[PDB]
């Protein structure tokens, strides 16, 4: 029933994501010099360094807000791909499966703890 435990759990999950070779395209903001019409297609850029900085600054209140920003990394990649068979989009689908597998217990434990706090 620890209401604060999600934050270190998310720190540890982000460390595992940075070690994954599949995170390479997503570790820093998309480079506009490489992809000059990126902002014609994507309204809200997001990347894993921005998620980690937001967590370490104390600017997430819950693991649901961190999960919304990580899901936006993967939705942006789907929207910007020219094909469902592309290399950067194929790395985004494997990394999304790994993330969803690990975030599920973090969300459940936090939501259970808040329900106990409010009982
Ligand atoms: C850049 C970039 N971001 O996502 C994809 N799918 C590409 C290409």
From Swiss-Prot:
Residues modified to Phosphoserine: 90
Domain spans labelled Bromo: 1-106
Compartment annotation: Nucleus
Tissue distribution of the protein: Expressed in myeloma and epidermoid carcinoma cell lines.
Cysteines joined through disulfide linkages: none
Domain of life: Eukaryota
Phosphothreonine modification, residue list: 44
Disease with which this protein is associated in UniProt: Chung-Jansen syndrome: An autosomal dominant disorder characterized by developmental delay, intellectual disability, autistic features, anxiety, hypotonia, obesity, and dysmorphic features.
Protein role: Probable regulator of the insulin and insulin-like growth factor signaling pathways. Stimulates cell proliferation through regulation of cyclin transcription and has an anti-apoptotic activity through AKT1 phosphorylation and activation. Plays a role in the regulation of cell morphology and cytoskeletal organization.
Subunit note: Interacts with IRS1 and IRS2. Interacts (via bromo domain) with acetylated lysine residues on histone H1.4, histone H3 and H4 (in vitro).
Protein known as: PH-interacting protein
Organism: Homo sapiens (Human)
Shown part of the complete sequence: 1316 to 1434 of 1821
